[PDB]
Amino acid sequence: LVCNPWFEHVSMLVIMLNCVTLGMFRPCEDVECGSERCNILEAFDAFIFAFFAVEMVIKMVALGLDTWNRLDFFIVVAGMMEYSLDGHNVSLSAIRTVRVLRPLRAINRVPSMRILVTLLLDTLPMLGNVLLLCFFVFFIFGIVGVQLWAGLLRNRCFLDSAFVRNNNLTFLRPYYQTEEGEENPFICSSRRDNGMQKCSHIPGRRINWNQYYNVCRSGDSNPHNGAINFDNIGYAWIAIFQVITLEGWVDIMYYVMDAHSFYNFIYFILLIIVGSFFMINLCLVVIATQFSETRIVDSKYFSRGIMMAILVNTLSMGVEYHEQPEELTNALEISNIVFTSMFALEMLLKLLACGPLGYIRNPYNIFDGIIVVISVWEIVGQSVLRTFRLLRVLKLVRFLPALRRQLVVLVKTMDNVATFCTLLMLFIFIFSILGMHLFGCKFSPDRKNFDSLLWAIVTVFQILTQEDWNVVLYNGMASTSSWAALYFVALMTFGNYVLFNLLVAILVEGFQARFRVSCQKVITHKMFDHVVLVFIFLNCVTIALERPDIDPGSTERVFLSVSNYIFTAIFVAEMMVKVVALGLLSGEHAYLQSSWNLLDGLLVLVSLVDIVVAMAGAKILGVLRVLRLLRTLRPLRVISRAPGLKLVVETLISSLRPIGNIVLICCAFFIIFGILGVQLFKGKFYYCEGPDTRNISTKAQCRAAHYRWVRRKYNFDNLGQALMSLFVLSSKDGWVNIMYDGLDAVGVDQQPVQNHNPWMLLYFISFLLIVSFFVLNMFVGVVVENFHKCRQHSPTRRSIHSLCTSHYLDLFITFIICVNVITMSMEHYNQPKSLDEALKYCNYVFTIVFVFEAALKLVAFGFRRFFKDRWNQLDLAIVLLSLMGITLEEIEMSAALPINPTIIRIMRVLRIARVLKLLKMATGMRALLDTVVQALPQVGNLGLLFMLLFFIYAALGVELFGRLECSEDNPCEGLSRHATFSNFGMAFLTLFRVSTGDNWNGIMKDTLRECSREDKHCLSYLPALSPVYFVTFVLVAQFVLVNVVVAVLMKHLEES
Ligand SMILES: CCCCCCCCCCCCCCC(=O)OC[C@H](COP(=O)(O)OCCN)OC(=O)CCCCCCCCCCCCCC
Ligand SMILES: CC(C)CCC[C@@H](C)[C@H]1CC[C@H]2[C@@H]3CC=C4C[C@@H](OC(=O)CCC(=O)O)CC[C@]4(C)[C@H]3CC[C@]12C
Ligand SMILES: CC(C)CCC[C@@H](C)[C@H]1CC[C@H]2[C@@H]3CC=C4C[C@@H](OC(=O)CCC(=O)O)CC[C@]4(C)[C@H]3CC[C@]12C
Ligand SMILES: CC(C)CCC[C@@H](C)[C@H]1CC[C@H]2[C@@H]3CC=C4C[C@@H](OC(=O)CCC(=O)O)CC[C@]4(C)[C@H]3CC[C@]12C
Ligand SMILES: CC(C)CCC[C@@H](C)[C@H]1CC[C@H]2[C@@H]3CC=C4C[C@@H](OC(=O)CCC(=O)O)CC[C@]4(C)[C@H]3CC[C@]12C
Ligand SMILES: C[C@@H](NC(=O)Cc1ccc(C2CC2)cc1)c1ccc(OCC(F)(F)F)cn1
Ligand SMILES: [Ca+2]
C-alpha cells in the first residue's frame, strides 16, 4: 500500500488531475452552478477529495501521529470544513477559496523541488535582520507621511457657498473637475499651505464658469477611488510599498507637491535610496551569502569565405521596411536564391570529400543539412519558412570559438535553473487561480482581468514584472475591499524579493564553485592639480546656469559669455604649459601618451573651434548647434584630477571585459528578434484616432469620418524602429502597451481589434524571459570576476548603579518605546477629540519616564562618565528635544500664541526619533548596517561618478529638450509641469525619475513627436538623438548601481 514506490506515482497522477480541475474554473460561469459542465466538475472534485481522505487515513493508520505530512493534513481538514459545511449559504463561496493550496502537495512528490524548498525554508530564518530594517523604513516614513499629508489629497476647488446661495444657481458641479472626471482630480493647495497648485491656476472656459471655483476645502474622496492617500498608517503603507517598487512613485509625489510643498521631493528622494535601493538590495546580498553558506574545404580561406557569406546574408535580411519598393523586394529574393545555392554548393562539396557517413559524423554538419533542405524547399514550394530563415545565424557558432564556449556555459546553466522554473510556474499557478476567486469578473471588461486562466496568468506575470501593477491594485481594492492589497503585497514579496533572489544565488554559487625646466617644476608641483580642479568646479557652475529663458541682452548672458572666454584661455595655458614641459608626442613620456591627457586635447580643440565660429555673420547656425552640444562634456575633466575617481572609472571599464561575450550575445538576440518583429508587425501599428471609432475598420473609413490615421511611437516598421521598441520592452517599462499593439494588429490599413491574435504573447513574453536571463548572467559575471580579484588580494547610589548596569532597565525602556510606536500609529485624519487628549497624556508619561532614566543614569555613572557613550548622548538629545516639543504645545494651548504653527508641526514630526533607541537593542541589524559602512570607501566614489554622470546629462538634456512644450494642441505623454528640462535644476530631478525607470518611455515619446509647423527653433534631427540620450543614460546609470551592489556583496562575503 504505502511501502510500494508506485503508490507515490499514483498520488502524483491524482495531483496533476486536481491542478487541471482547478484551472478549468470559470469565475462567473460556475458561481451560478446552473450548468451541466460545472456539475460534472464538482463531482470530479468530490472524487479527488475522497482519494486524499482515503490516503491520509491509510497513512495515519500505518504511521500514526514531517512538516509536509502536516501540510497535507491541513488541506484535508480545510477541505472537509468546506465539504461538510455545504448546505449553509453564509460565506460558502468564500470558503471555496481554500482549495488553491492543493497544488502545493506536488512539492513533496518531486524530489528536486522538495530539496530546493527545504533549502529555501532554511534560508528564511536569517532574513529577519533585513525584516527589522523593513519595519524601521515603513514605520518611520509611514508616520512622517501621515503627520504631514493627512487629508490634503481630499482638497478640491469648490464654489463659494454664498455665491451659489445668493445667485440661486445649482446647475454647475459643486467643485472643479476635468471632463475626465475623478480619474484625474484637480487637487488644490489650501490657503494656509504653499502647494504648487492653487485654485487660481484653473484653466478658463473653452461668461466663464471656471473662474468662480475659488475655495479650496476638503472633498469627499481621495485619488483613485480612495486607494492613494495618507489619512492613516494603513493607507500610508500602501503608498510607501508602491514607492518601494518604483511603479507610480512619481504620481504620489506630484500629488503632495501640488498640495503641500514643492520641497516634498526630499521625502521621496530619501525613500528611493534608503528603501528602494539599499533595503531591497540588502535582501539580495543576504540570501546569496547564506546560500553560499549552505583539402581545400578545410582551408582557412574557404571557412572565412563561407563565414562572410552567412554574415552578408544576415545583413540583407534586416533591410526590409514598410512601403517597401517592388524592386528592392525582387533584389532580396534573388540574393536569397544565390545564397541558398552557395550553401547547397558547400552542402555538396563536403559530402563528396567525407562521404555520406563522414559528413553525418560532425554534429554541426548535421545542422547545416537541415538548413539547406528547407531553403531549397521554399524556392521549390513557391511564407512560414521565411520566418525560419533567421536560423542561418546559428551557423556562425562553427567559427566563433569564444562565443561557442560562452554559449555552452549559458546552456549548462539551464540544468540548475530547471528546478527553479518549475517552482516559478507552480507559484504563479496558485496565485492565478487565487486571483480568479477573489477578482473574478469584478473589474467592469479591462484587459488586465482575472476572468479566465489565460488572462489571469498574464496578469500575475505582469504584476511580477512590476508594470502597471498599481492599476490592477486600484481595481482590486475598489471591487472587493482595501484589504485586497494583501494579495499584491504577498505576490510581489514572495515572488520578487525571495524567489528571484534565490535564482541569483543558484547562479552565483554554481559559477563560484631653461623655461621647460620651470614648466617641469610647476606641473609637478603638489597643488597644481587642486588649483586647476578649482577652476574646473567654477566652470561647472557656469554650465549649470545655462538655460533657454536667458534674455540675450541681459547682464547674465554677458557675464556667461565673458566667463567662457576666461576659462578657454585658462585651460589653453594649462594645456600649453604641459606640452612644453613634456612634448606633444615625440617623447616616450609625451603629453599625448596617456588617454586622459588626450581627452583634455579634444575638449580644448573644440573650444578653439567654438571661438572661430563665434568670430564668424554667416550660415553656420547648424555648426554652432553641434558645438553647443559637445561643450557639455567639459565636466569630464574632473576624473583625471581626482585620484579616487580615476581608479574607480578604470575599474568599471575592467569589469566589462569578463561579460563582453554575453553583451555580444545579447546584442545578437536584439537583432534576431528585431528582424523577426519587423516581418510580423511592419505596417500594422496604425490606428484611427478619434472620440468614437467603434464603426471604423480601415484607413478610408478613418478619413471619411474626418478622424486621423496615426502611428504608434514604438512600432516595428523597420529595424531602426524595432530596436527602439525592443529596448523599451527589455527595460520592462511600457512593455505591456507594446504587447497590446502586437495582439491587436490585423494588417496594413486595418483598424486593430482587441486580442485579435492572442498567440503573439509568445513573441513578447519569450523576449522578456530570455533577456532577463542574460541580464542575470551579467550581474553574476561581474560578481565572479570580483571574487577572483578579491581572493588573489555610597549605599544609596550602589543600588541605582546595579539597576542601570542590569538589563532590566534596558528591556523596560524597549517596552515603553514599543508602546510609544503603537500610540504614534493611532493618529489619523479627523480623529475624535477624546483621542487627542488621550494621546497627549500618553506623551506625558513617556517624557517623565525618559527623564527618570537619564536621572538614574547620571547618578549611576557620573556626569563625566555618562557623557562618554554616544548612546547616552542620544538619550540626552531626545529627552531635551522632547521637553522642547511638549513645552511649546502648552504655550500653544495657553492664551499667548506667538508660536508659528509650522514650528509645532515640525516638533511633533521630530518626536519619532525615539525609535532610534530600539536600534541599540538590535545587534543583528546594526551588524548588517556595519557591512555597508565598511564598504563606504568603495561605494563613496561610485556615488561621485553617479553625480558626475547626472551633471553631464542634466546639462546635456537642457540643451536638447529645453524648449519642448505641452499644450492641448500638442499634448505630451510623459512630460508635465513637474518633469521638464527647462533648467538644470529641473533636468536633474527628471533624470532621477528616469534612473528609477518610472515612465521614462513616456518622456522619450514626447521628444520623438514632431514639432509644430508654426513653432520655431525646433531641431530637425532631434528624433535621432533622443533614443541615444535615453539608452546610454539608462545603461550607464544601471551599471554603476550594479557595481555598488557588488561592492557591498564582496564586503559581506569577506566578513563571514
Ligand atoms: C510595516 C508595513 C509593511 C508592509 C506594508 C504594505 C502595505 C500594507 C497594506 C495592507 C492593508 C490593507 C488595508 C488598508 C487600509 O487601511 O484600509 C482598510 C480600511 C478601509 O477599508 P474598508 O473596506 O473597511 O473601507 C471602509 C470605508 N468606510 O481602513 C480603515 O478604515 C482602517 C483600517 C485599519 C487601519 C490600518 C492599521 C493596520 C495597518 C495596515 C495593515 C497592513 C499591515 C502591513 C504589515
Ligand atoms: C544591424 C545589421 C544586422 C543590419 C543593418 C541594418 C540596416 C539595414 C537598417 C538599420 C537602419 C535602417 C533604416 C532606418 C530608416 C530608414 C528610412 C526609411 O524611410 C525613408 O527612406 C525615408 C525617406 C525620406 O526621408 O523622404 C526607409 C528604411 C530605412 C532606410 C531603414 C532600412 C533598414 C536599415 C538601413
Ligand atoms: C555644482 C553645480 C551643479 C552648481 C550648483 C547648482 C546650481 C548652478 C543650480 C542649482 C539650483 C539652480 C537654480 C534653481 C532655480 C532657478 C530659478 C529658475 O528661474 C527661471 O527660469 C525663471 C523663473 C521665473 O521667471 O519665474 C531657473 C534658474 C535658477 C536660478 C537655477 C539656476 C541654476 C542653479 C543655481
Ligand atoms: C542593441 C540595443 C542595446 C539597442 C541599442 C540602442 C538603440 C535603441 C538605438 C541606437 C541608435 C538608434 C537609432 C538612431 C537613428 C534612428 C533614425 C530615426 O529616424 C529618423 O531619422 C527620423 C527623424 C528625422 O526626421 O530625422 C528613427 C530612430 C532610429 C532608428 C534610432 C532608434 C534607436 C537606436 C537603434
Ligand atoms: C501598529 C498599528 C498599525 C496597529 C494599531 C493601529 C490602529 C489602532 C489604528 C491605525 C489607523 C486607525 C484607523 C484609521 C482610520 C479609520 C477610519 C475612520 O472612519 C471610517 O471608518 C471611514 C473610512 C473611510 O471612509 O475611508 C474610523 C477610525 C479608523 C478605523 C481608525 C481606527 C484606529 C486605527 C485602526
Ligand atoms: C531597478 C533597481 N536597480 C538596481 O538597484 C541595480 C541592480 C540592477 C540589476 C541587478 C540584477 C538581478 C539582475 C541587481 C541590482 C533600481 C534602479 C535605480 C534606483 O534609484 C537610483 C537612485 F535613486 F539611487 F539614483 C533604485 N533601484
Ligand atoms: Ca513603469
Side-chain angles (χ1 to χ4, degrees), residues 900-943:
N900 180 291
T902 296
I903 306 306
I904 288 294
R905 197 168 200 156
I906 292 304
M907 271 318 145
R908 294 201 90 265
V909 152
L910 241 187
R911 87 204 194 79
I912 200 184
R914 302 164 187 183
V915 165
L916 266 61
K917 314 253 199 291
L918 303 176
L919 205 141
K920 145 171 161 55
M921 289 274 114
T923 55
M925 184 174 74
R926 281 165 47 215
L928 197 65
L929 269 65
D930 195 55
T931 291
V932 190
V933 176
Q934 263 49 227
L936 271 182
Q938 312 146 20
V939 167
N941 296 277
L942 283 157

Side-chain angles (χ1 to χ4, degrees), residues 135-150 230-237 240 267 271 817-828 839 905-915 918:
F135 280 8
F136 274 53
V137 171
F138 273 80
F139 268 105
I140 283 169
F141 283 103
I143 293 161
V144 169
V146 171
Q147 289 282 337
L148 299 162
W149 319 309
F230 292 86
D231 289 357
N232 68 56
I233 202 75
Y235 272 112
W237 287 344
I240 286 163
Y267 178 102
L271 182 48
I817 289 173
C818 283
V819 165
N820 204 158
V821 167
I822 293 285
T823 57
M824 260 189 296
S825 302
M826 298 182 108
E827 320 218 11
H828 52 275
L839 298 178
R905 197 168 200 156
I906 292 304
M907 271 318 145
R908 294 201 90 265
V909 152
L910 241 187
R911 87 204 194 79
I912 200 184
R914 302 164 187 183
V915 165
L918 303 176

Side-chain angles (χ1 to χ4, degrees), residues 508 511 655 658-659 662 776-786:
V508 164
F511 288 16
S655 278
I659 72 180
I662 301 166
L776 282 193
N777 288 258
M778 280 168 229
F779 181 91
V780 174
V782 171
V783 169
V784 169
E785 183 250 346
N786 264 272

Side-chain angles (χ1 to χ4, degrees), residues 246 272 277 281 500 775-776 779 946 992 995-996 1038 1041-1042:
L246 302 172
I272 293 312
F277 182 62
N281 284 304
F500 180 78
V775 166
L776 282 193
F779 181 91
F946 206 66
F992 186 89
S995 80
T996 58
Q1038 292 295 328
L1041 292 165
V1042 161

Side-chain angles (χ1 to χ4, degrees), residues 323-397:
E323 293 189 309
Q324 195 157 348
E326 292 193 327
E327 51 251 47
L328 172 53
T329 317
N330 306 347
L332 255 56
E333 196 31 289
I334 291 156
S335 191
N336 169 60
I337 291 281
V338 171
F339 274 118
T340 179
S341 181
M342 280 210 323
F343 301 152
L345 180 61
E346 167 264 13
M347 184 41 63
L348 182 277
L349 259 59
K350 281 174 177 172
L351 274 167
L352 288 179
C354 297
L357 288 174
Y359 195 75
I360 264 57
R361 196 85 277 157
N362 172 292
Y364 297 112
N365 280 358
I366 287 163
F367 168 76
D368 280 319
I370 321 164
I371 285 298
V372 197
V373 310
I374 50 138
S375 312
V376 171
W377 181 358
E378 159 166 43
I379 304 152
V380 176
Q382 184 178 13
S383 68
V384 186
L385 329 167
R386 197 190 181 90
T387 286
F388 270 65
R389 292 216 292 229
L390 298 177
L391 289 178
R392 297 176 184 179
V393 312
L394 277 305
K395 298 166 159 269
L396 282 178
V397 174

